[PDB]
Amino acid sequence: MASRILLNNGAKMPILGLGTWKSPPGQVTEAVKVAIDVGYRHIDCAHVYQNENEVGVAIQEKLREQVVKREELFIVSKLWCTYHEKGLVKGACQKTLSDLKLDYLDLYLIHWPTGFKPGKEFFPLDESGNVVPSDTNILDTWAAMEELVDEGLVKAIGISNFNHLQVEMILNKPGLKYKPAVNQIECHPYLTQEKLIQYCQSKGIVVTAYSPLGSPDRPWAKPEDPSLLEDPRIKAIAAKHNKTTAQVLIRFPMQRNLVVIPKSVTPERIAENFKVFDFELSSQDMTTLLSYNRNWRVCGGLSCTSHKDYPFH
Numbered sequence: 001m002a003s004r005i006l007l008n009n010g011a012k013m014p015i016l017g018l019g020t021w022k023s024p025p026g027q028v029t030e031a032v033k034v035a036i037d038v039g040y041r042h043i044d045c046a047h048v049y050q051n052e053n054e055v056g057v058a059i060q061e062k063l064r065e066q067v068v069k070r071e072e073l074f075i076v077s078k079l080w081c082t083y084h085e086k087g088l089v090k091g092a093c094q095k096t097l098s099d100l101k102l103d104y105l106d107l108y109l110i111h112w113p114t115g116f117k118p119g120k121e122f123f124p125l126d127e128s129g130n131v132v133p134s135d136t137n138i139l140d141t142w143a144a145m146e147e148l149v150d151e152g153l154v155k156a157i158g159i160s161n162f163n164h165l166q167v168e169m170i171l172n173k174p175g176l177k178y179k180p181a182v183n184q185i186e187c188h189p190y191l192t193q194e195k196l197i198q199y200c201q202s203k204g205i206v207v208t209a210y211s212p213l214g215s216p217d218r219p220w221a222k223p224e225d226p227s228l229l230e231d232p233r234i235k236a237i238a239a240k241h242n243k244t245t246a247q248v249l250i251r252f253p254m255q256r257n258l259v260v261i262p263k264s265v266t267p268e269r270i271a272e273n274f275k276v277f278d279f280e281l282s283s284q285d286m287t288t289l290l291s292y293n294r295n296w297r298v299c300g301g302l303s304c305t306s307h308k309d310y311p312f313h
């Protein structure tokens, strides 16, 4: 298992990264410092997470310490839905760059295919509770992303939470200049995504699997929900390999040629989650894990289900 995957922009991306959604601002600086100290070279970020300044403190301190060189890091962020306007994309990217302490991003993603009315609120609502859309379509947002490459702000551009038809719409864009490098989607044994993964990979788009552990800290978790980390069938595969259940859940997408971005702010778990390059799941293990699919989503985008570009109908 090589540590990096080749993207369609010619750059290499580490297949394991650290997630930062829900990482508290008072804990994420140490989390990222620990991650870099124990070997992580890829950090997954977003403006909507409200913690990029604190992530950036860690990155900048490890660069200053010469623990790593900038060229050895792969930093990802995402354009939030309220910035799908031609005239707002550059400033949104620059705010992320300034918060992260960087002069370029390795990868910048359209966070969701749904554009919302610009303003201070990340989910602008009508008086009846529906998100207020923007009329800017995703192809015009893509053209704005392409400009960022041509201005040197980002090395690669991609998409997130795009369905098969939405990926195809960009690939078929008249005058397309840069193909998406990555589609970042939810993926784990309860949402195995065979169809969408096959399509993206067949087009040379690398897939990143988010919520690989089933996001046990998601804010809307309910006791009756299925739990990957507590599934006895997955625990049994882990026991057979003398690994933890989390380590199996991280290795699983790696063996599907995916990038994977488990989140932790716990130093011991950050280290545990990196120790996944020294064992191999069998083909039978892989097929068994795939068999657990039930089309269950952590991230249903429930605050934007009324938007015309909602991806999960």
Ligand SMILES: NC(=O)c1ccc[n+]([C@@H]2O[C@H](COP(=O)([O-])OP(=O)(O)OC[C@H]3O[C@@H](n4cnc5c(N)ncnc54)[C@H](OP(=O)(O)O)[C@@H]3O)[C@@H](O)[C@H]2O)c1
Binding pocket: 018, 019, 020, 021, 022, 044, 045, 111, 160, 161, 184, 185, 209, 210, 211, 212, 213, 214, 215, 216, 217, 218, 229, 244, 246, 247, 261, 262, 263, 264, 265, 266, 269, 270, 272, 273, 298, 299
């Ligand atoms: N593009 C998108 O729309 C999108 C959506 C969702 C997620 N993402 C990205 O994907 C990342 C990962 O997804 P996620 O944050 O939803 O969840 P996740 O990585 O599936 O799970 C994170 C949870 O698992 C716990 N955990 C981590 N390692 C563990 C271990 N070894 N043993 C036991 N528990 C462990 C963490 O606890 P502690 O932190 O307390 O240790 C946290 O509660 C996000 O942080 C974000 O970067 C992107």
